Symmetry: C3
Subunit: 556 residues, 3 copies
């Protein structure tokens, strides 16, 4: 009896699943630790009551089952580590990319990829019918409407963290939770449902809910997603340090519109220091209102009368995000009064950025080789009256067609860099107000150029230029400077030159016939013109007093 007293005081308490017939039996026995040391086959909806205990759940085996294993009544501070979810069903999956990692877009080609596997692809859903037009008709019935996910559901808990989770056809659902985290996800391979979901459609708005670190792969829909979460002014929630690969829909998604009877939208979350690669749809989908065929109202949210569609004060903190390889859109937002910074998007088949934003500011944005499949009208679209400060455009891809690169018709932009085709820029105002003394350095040409283009006049033709051109060859120490203007849609049609052929003189264009009175603009100026009938140059003079006189300028 004496040893048992000492033993009870000196040893760490932990129960292990190998000692119990059911997970509930183990949960009931647990006091401090719970070890999952044997695989456990659960039935869909199997529910475990943890009695409000603050438990440290250490997983060293699998939870096996289609459907949801539901954890309830875990005490604040509970931790679940190393969990591995696996379905019983091996579904039919598609793999819409090649052995060289080229996206497949042809429906028949995608159908040909069908195999039964728990990974290396995903179960088709109805969004695939849109993504791969014609695939709905071509998919065999056994590959349509599948619904396989093995989901760990944390239900109505506060202060629970799931660490280093993994699995096959695996999902993680936090339903009605607060102050919960999915930490260092160990590359679970997804199933039919979202891989990581914070859903708060009932009860209080979700808060304190984060994805921190880790990564996921595959899944039929989005990798990390939020419904009805509001981080407060404290920005207590969101996604930080996360990587998503090959989402069947999007890497990171804040839901839009009405789900069930209420709002699925999200406010005041962080989206930072994260990476989304090769999503079938979008990299980051951070809008709150429905784009196509929107609801006319927002039950449970601000009414349309207060904030028009796409003008919600979402107020997310969005910074240092990278996207590569989207088959859809790299980076999507809506809202009014938004800020986003340090966003880099590369090699996307649809728009790099699709921004349904108004009175918003975008700082240091890089959109590099996007809309490569011409899925959208442009590489970056901005609907409302926004500011862009720093915009890198164009990597190494050319564009064969007529699509715009940036269409931001109400936006004021500064600091574009890259080999953009200037005819493919459309903005409200473009300006470099604060440059210093400037030098234009020309390589691979016999001239250097400072060109002007008035887009109201022509988007495709420069209206005037300042050139410097080599006289002779390399090392001559001689160039001529040229000031030009467009006429008859012919760039550089009319020009004044300084030092052509090293002559040390100015070559001055004159009106080729009798100049009309209205040709001269300013007082105390003269305009030379040709009088062919005498082989003479004349001068139309507007005198200092503004009155016109015609003089003889040069004679035989």
């Amino acid at each position: 009896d004496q040893y048992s007293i000492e033993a009870d005081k000196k040893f760490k308490y932990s129960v292990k699943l190998s000692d119990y017939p059911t997970l509930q039996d183990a949960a009931s026995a647990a006091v401090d630790g719970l070890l999952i040391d044997r695989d456990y086959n659960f039935y869909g909806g199997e529910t475990v009551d943890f009695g409000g205990k603050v438990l440290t759940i250490e997983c060293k085996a699998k939870f096996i089952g289609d459907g949801n294993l539901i954890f309830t009544k875990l005490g604040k501070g509970s931790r679940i580590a190393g969990v591995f979810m696996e379905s019983t069903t091996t579904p039919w999956v598609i793999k819409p990319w090649t052995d060289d990692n080229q996206w497949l877009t042809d429906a028949a080609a995608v159908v040909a990829t069908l195999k039964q596997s728990k990974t290396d692809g995903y179960q088709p859903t109805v969004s695939d019918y849109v993504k791969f037009p014609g695939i709905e008709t071509l998919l065999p019935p056994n590959a349509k409407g599948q619904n396989i996910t093995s989901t760990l559901e944390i239900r109505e808990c506060i202060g629970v963290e799931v660490h280093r989770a993994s699995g096959l056809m695996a999902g993680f659902l936090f339903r009605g939770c607060h102050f919960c985290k999915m930490v260092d996800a160990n590359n679970p391979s997804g199933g039919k449902d979202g891989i990581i979901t914070f859903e708060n459609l009932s009860g209080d708005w979700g808060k304190g809910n984060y994805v921190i670190g880790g990564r996921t792969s595959y899944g039929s829909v989005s990798s990390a997603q939020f419904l009805r979460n509001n981080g407060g002014f404290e920005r207590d929630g969101g996604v930080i340090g996360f990587t998503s690969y090959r989402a069947g829909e999007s890497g990171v998604k804040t839901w839009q519109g009405t789900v069930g009877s209420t709002t699925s939208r999200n406010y005041n979350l962080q989206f930072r220091d994260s990476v989304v690669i090769y999503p079938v749809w979008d990299g980051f989908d951070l809008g709150a209102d429905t784009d196509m065929n929107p609801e006319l109202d927002r039950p449970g949210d601000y009414p349309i009368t207060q904030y028009p569609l796409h003008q919600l004060p979402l107020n997310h903190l969005i910074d240092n995000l990278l996207v590569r390889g989207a088959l859809g859109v790299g980076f999507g937002m809506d809202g009014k009064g938004m800020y986003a910074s340090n966003i880099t998007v590369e090699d996307c088949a649809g728009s790099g950025a699709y921004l349904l934003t108004h009175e918003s500011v975008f700082t240091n944005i890089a959109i590099i080789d996007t809309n490569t499949k011409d899925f959208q009208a442009n590489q970056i679209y901005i609907s409302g009256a926004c500011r862009v400060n720093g915009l890198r455009l164009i990597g190494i891809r050319s564009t064969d067609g007529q699509s715009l690169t940036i269409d931001a018709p109400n936006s004021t932009v500064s600091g574009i860099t890259g080999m953009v085709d200037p005819s493919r820029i459309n903005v409200a105002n473009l300006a470099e107000e604060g440059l210093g003394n400037i030098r234009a350095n020309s390589f691979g040409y016999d001239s250097a150029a400072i060109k002007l283009r008035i887009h109201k006049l022509s988007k495709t033709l420069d209206s005037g230029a300042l050139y410097s051109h080599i006289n002779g060859g390399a090392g001559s120490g001689s160039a001529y400077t040229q000031l030009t203007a467009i006429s008859g849609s012919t760039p550089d049609a009319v020009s004044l030159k300084v030092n052509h052929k090293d002559c040390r003189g100015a070559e001055i264009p004159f009106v080729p016939d009798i100049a009309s009175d209205d040709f001269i603009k300013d007082s105390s100026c003269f305009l030379p013109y040709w009088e062919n009938n005498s082989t003479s140059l004349k001068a139309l003079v507007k005198k200092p007093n503004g009155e016109l006189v015609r003089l003889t300028l040069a004679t035989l």
Copy 2:
């Protein structure tokens, strides 16, 4: 007796606080693990001696008390996880922001926010008397001079990590420690003192001390702070991956000046990959010398004779920092020979950056909508002779008054982007030395412009321009080019035109009266001028040999 031998070998050792009357009793019994499984009321200054043992302290309950719970003699490698500090006192707190997250600046409005709470605000301190002028007189006595914090103090330990700490009116103090870390702080709500402090005023300079990950909220003073730490050339210390919200003073602070009898300054620390949002004072305060009313000496540090005020070789590694919503200054530094890179500051009421630096380099800085309340003279200030390479200025806010945007009078700057008002730029030298061939693309105007402004002549008026202007309307295929110069403070007063009204000729300005000899600059050039008494143009000619002659140029 046989079972006890086997049991002692096969089970993990842990003691738990529920088995002991005092925390010291539990600490003394511990060998490997220590579980805090009941709330523990501690008295201020209660000191626990852990006997040099390498302990894994797992907290699943609260430490409750005003004042400091002092942990001593923990072995290297000890870990404390999940600690939760809470005060016994519920103090009076102010909440100087509105339900729309607008800062309150009026003292009377701030006083009206007073409530008794352990969170959602902070206890006033003497710095509030400066921040909210007049508040000292208006605060009730019971809201002044409060001193409530529940602090975990790790004293004179090496290699101790505190993980996932939280609390209410909570603080964490590492006093005289080395190689200690505050890891993944779980959003403790702060009290009167700094939330996370590495203080090494006695003993060896602090080294190896980090804040890694996590976040904090509220507190009366700074969220994370350092005194007398030196990371060495190895840069072994600092703040990485951290978020601070609503510091009563600053998000991250390296102390300045003398504290007690010695230096509180810091060297060779990292400040990287971190975020500070809504501090009442500053985002990052990384200076070492006192700005206002500085000490005349530096006991315990380099003397003023070796390094003048603000010119210490602090040598921090500063990169990838974000600040939004400061009521004070976003980003502050001093030092000589400093580097900072990839700093983004948005929506601050005081200066975005206040840099008391000399011979320092700033790369890729973005200061976006700051000094919004005109608290300072500018949005970014630099005192000494520094280099800025990449500077984004202006989001969507206008400035109504006369404040400068950048005042860096000794600095050389390149790569400004944004809709800056050029009259609000003051630098030593501004240049784009390495641009390629250039095109100026104009949207929303009937002209395109390349302007020149000589700030010595005028900060507010362009001194000359190269324009292209539409002739006719859109699609005309015709424009005129114009070269202009300022006269009588009237921009574009004098100009030469090419192709005005599609005339295909150059319109040339002439001197409106008899030209003085000194009007002509160069040899082998001529200057037309008006002789009104004969209705003639004359030419003042400087011949190739440099001698002047006056010729008749155009006649009736």
Copy 3:
């Protein structure tokens, strides 16, 4: 007997090394936990078989020994925390930097630093003979050819993580492993071999192998390195959130060429959000093919016939990297079709970037004060036909010699910022195609300038300019505009002026002698020239019909 049944169910299982004579004995007894609670002296090659068990190994003492402690047959999900490796030998180390952190380059000075220590320096290797020319002759024999490392070797394991490792003369080797991680390395001080190595020369290509977080210091060779790893399209491996200090070779290295009988190269890895400071060689060395004296083949990899040298489809994900203080090259790559973004390199003695890349894209690169010791021909070199979009050049250092800043002769570049000497730019094409309306703001001069330089003509002299110059002094409200051209290698030799001396007229240069027919370029233009024998200006006129006529323009 009843208590033993209950005890076996309610307590956590862990064995501890203090109860066993050998580590294998402890490993054999272990079921769940294993505690290292006494220092353990191991012999080189001592091999522990963990029986496929999923073990949680908690280290609170040292593994002491020169050579490798080899862990085998650990179950997937096994974790080793807090491990501390230490050599038995205290070797001779060099410390090639001063007490002011200046690099020592002189061999004799480096030899003078020799001391016996397990840290604060490194054991010389053969690469030091190249790095410090002449040192091979000057090093005492007892400091050459040393081979001290205490290495934890994880051999042929899947799903094993080493967390918070540290040590002295310490190394960590994952040999033939997959899905293994080195997490939050706690600043181990390195020995002779790489500090963290994933080597997969035998068996399947390495995959799922990461360095996540943490830091290392010293070591004779590279801090983190990979051999024959391929992360797949999923990019499942690499280095994220890591810091390397004072690598004896490089911070992060993907091996090049043949090692043994097969390829050591790597594909599809992540290199992100990491920092390398003060490497003796390079910051990030991410090439796959050997630069100097390359192999003529690639056994085990793509043949040269498929992909030429330096043109492998390595396809790494490279983003948000910082390097400071390299004695060699900051950032090195090779490959074809590569992308890298958001790379910042400061204060390197060799090139900031050395890029043996083709058809690759570099976005937002900052190379700030590099090649400071003229070790290479330039600060950034690019061999093949690449695109650079955003390139910051020059901090505060000057260059005294003739070295180029960027030499990227086949590359097209846009968006250079900084005080680069334009004569030190060499690229295929440099352009700013998409700027808006422009203003050149001049500070510290009596003029503002927009210059043109045709590098084919001269790399050192501007070929033409548009100036604005003050007339009178500050506040005069008057300037003159000047359009210039180079002649006889004299910049600004020939010019047209508008408003010189506030005269309100254009000063027009004329040919100083009789103009040749070929001097005039365009029809409907005239060229003034001097007839000295009559003191007359003439006009060489190209009439609207293209025929030449000579007229009298101005007469006495």
